Design a protein around this ligand. Structure first.
Ligand SMILES: [Pb+2]
Ligand SMILES: [Pb+2]
Ligand SMILES: [Pb+2]
Ligand SMILES: [Pb+2]
Ligand SMILES: [Pb+2]
Ligand SMILES: [Pb+2]
Ligand SMILES: [Pb+2]
Lengths: 395, 395
RNA sequence: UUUUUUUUUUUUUUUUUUUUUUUUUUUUUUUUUUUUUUUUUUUUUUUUUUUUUUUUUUUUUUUUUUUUUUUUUUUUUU
């Protein structure tokens, strides 16, 4: 009963808080991010704006705010109306956006011709043009493209712009929730999307361009908020959709629950396996903690998928330090059960090596073990079980 | 019957008092804390006021009321409106705030230019400027910041002010619930936030600057009240939030339940492990006390997390001396189960060495022990427990 | 005391039908099937013994009180 009090104490303190809806935080000063608005549907203008913006993101000298704005502009370039899609960013409590409606480039470019609506000094028009022509020297051939010719393409048709725009944007999406050498995962993502025809090999970025974009995305909270909103929009899409959002929806599935490996891997291997060692008394308190954490996770809503991206403090609640023994135990199981697990960074401060090996050996010696609620539905006999255990221990 | 009477006696007298919510205490004389108010959003002034205030906090000659007011000012500098957030401090029963609306600095400075609204004698203007030029002599280069040339930056853009402001305030947050060399945790909180980009390494403070800030915060109750009000607001934030409060919410989770290690560690290891020795008759009375204490913790509300910060007398209720045997027993368990536990200051006056070793030995010899409610749901067999038990005597 | 995150995560075989498939014997009836003996009554069957009462049967000792009966250790964090 005192033990019953302790279980209820654990679960309620985790969930008391989350009665109320979130309150929008006290207001704070914000940097202004400038996002470019193109009213024209012209393929050549759209493409040069993408190319223009991509260069500012990668440029040596741009401030973070310039880089963020260029990104937000790129991600809005597929829209029929960019303006509506930029207002998505306004939904971020950290965002202060300046829209900068544009109208075109002085051909040869990248000298901005600004819309009537808002002027620009020829100092800043020229300053941007210099910024678009800076670029690091680590990049090969004055461009970010591995193919020193793409930027010289003739953007006569909208098909071509969209093929590049989606291809460039997909590479940004692929590096969205990576803390950052690596990475094997990235090059396999690229290969999936090439074979699906979502990424066109002509428009791959030099690996250096991607690492810079990865960095800007990790730094930019407003940017990440905007990606979250888009990812949610991709969730609500019909089975019959358009090309971009089907694409975003697919890459979104890799991004979901990013940064929460310790929690979900612990569920998968410790509780998923349902081995007899789960009945240890030591796990008892921690088993209640995971139970609360699952309860907490659903109450959070759809957006619990995006805590890492959102930089939410709730990411702290699910930290493995709250269930160190079970985590250790799960890591060991994960270690033998899956070959890919070796390269997971499971090593940690509170990691208890004793329970780690316990998971390891549990997985080797008790694999013949059966879920007796399954075993009874199948009407398994105890001769069948041991000599089910006798094929698997030998294998 | 006598014993059931004893349980209800223990539990009711602990919770008797807590029906009625608390009444605001009889009024007392208070020192005046002066907080500087800035109406301007200009980056250079915001940055100089932060630097000005930081110097007064660290200054040799400032009196405590000055240090407190300067701290309250720094913590309010991110605000779009400082005046509103300083009124949060007014919610403290120990607080008497004078607002001192400011308007700027005479260039070169730190000579305050005060708002028309409230005048200043040129003696007090010059006196403050002198106070900002005190600083201890142990501090290297007459600045904090480690990097001796940061203060010479040109704070022309709001991004830079915020990048510093958040970086400096975060270091204050990290040292908030520390009683007072070492302090190893501080160095890991710092590298965590550097890796998250929440703290910019350019603006780290010299370790002695932090140790002074540590000291100011523990001395200052109204300051500590204000931090609490901020942590509570950080708690109610949406998943989509702003940069500062996401930051505060995260660091806040380290601060929660500070100063209550004995209670929660006893719960964690003694009750969490659910080992058979918990059935000792000696623990019988103390187990009821813990049961009462958890019950007491819930009645207190969310603010039960901040008892150490609040300086609440309730922090005495949870003192380990009320359950010495269970506490001792728990400490021994933690000591073997967790390597980090060695460095906790578990030694105490009422510490009972017999039960400590008992906790120690319980934790080694009975880890194969199973939670019999789990073991039955998994349908564990009596052979399985033993194969598992010194499977677990083990390693 | 400890308490950010790090792996994996598109698809890929097979996938029309096929034989058999009406009927066919037997299938009214048929014996036996009224009755039949015995079958009123019959002994015993009023009552007569005993059947008032009868001893013992007030009370009776003991039966106020009394020792002890303030306090004292431990008790913030880590
Ligand atoms: Pb504007
Ligand atoms: Pb505008
Ligand atoms: Pb991450
Ligand atoms: Pb006043
Ligand atoms: Pb005033
Ligand atoms: Pb990483
Ligand atoms: Pb007579």
């Amino acid at each position: 009963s005192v033990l019953k009090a302790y279980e209820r104490f654990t679960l309620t303190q985790e969930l008391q808080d989350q009665s109320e809806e979130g309150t929008i935080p006290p207001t704070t000063l914000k940097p202004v991010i400038r996002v470019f608005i193109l009213t024209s549907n012209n393929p050549e203008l759209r493409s040069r704006l993408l190319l223009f913006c991509l260069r500012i993101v990668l440029s040596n000298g741009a401030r973070d705010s310039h880089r963020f704005g260029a990104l937000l502009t790129m991600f809005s370039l597929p829209s029929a109306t960019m303006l509506n899609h930029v207002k998505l960013a306004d939904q971020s409590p950290e965002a202060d956006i300046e829209r900068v409606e544009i109208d075109g480039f002085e051909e040869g470019s990248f000298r901005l011709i600004p819309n009537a609506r808002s002027g620009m000094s020829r100092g800043e028009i020229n300053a941007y043009a210099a910024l678009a022509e800076d670029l690091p020297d680590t990049l090969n051939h004055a461009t970010p493209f591995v193919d020193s010719e793409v930027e010289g393409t003739a953007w006569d048709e909208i098909e071509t712009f969209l093929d590049m725009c989606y291809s460039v944007l997909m590479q940004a999406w692929i590096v969205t929730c990576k803390c950052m050498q690596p990475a094997a995962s990235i090059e396999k993502r690229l290969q999936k999307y090439r074979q699906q025809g979502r990424i066109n090999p002509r428009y791959l970025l030099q690996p250096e361009a991607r690492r810079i974009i990865q960095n800007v995305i990790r730094k930019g909270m407003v940017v990440r908020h905007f990606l979250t909103f888009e990812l949610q929009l991709a969730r609500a899409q019909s089975l019959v959709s358009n090309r971009y959002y089907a694409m975003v929806g697919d890459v979104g599935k890799y991004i979901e629950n990013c940064g929460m490996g310790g929690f979900f891997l612990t569920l998968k291997y410790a509780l998923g396996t349902r081995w007899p060692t789960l009945a240890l008394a030591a796990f008892s308190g921690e088993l209640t903690k995971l139970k609360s954490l699952m309860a907490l996770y659903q109450t959070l809503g759809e957006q619990a998928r995006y805590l890492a991206l959102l930089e939410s403090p709730h990411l702290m609640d699910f930290a493995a330090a709250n269930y160190p023994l079970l985590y250790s135990y799960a890591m060991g199981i994960g270690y033998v059960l899956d070959v890919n697990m070796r390269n997971y960074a499971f090593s940690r401060s509170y990691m208890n090596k004793t329970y780690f090996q316990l998971g390891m050996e549990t997985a080797r010696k008790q694999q013949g073990a059966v879920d007796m609620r399954m075993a009874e539905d199948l009407g398994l006999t105890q001769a069948e079980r041991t000599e089910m255990a006798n094929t698997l221990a030998k294998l």
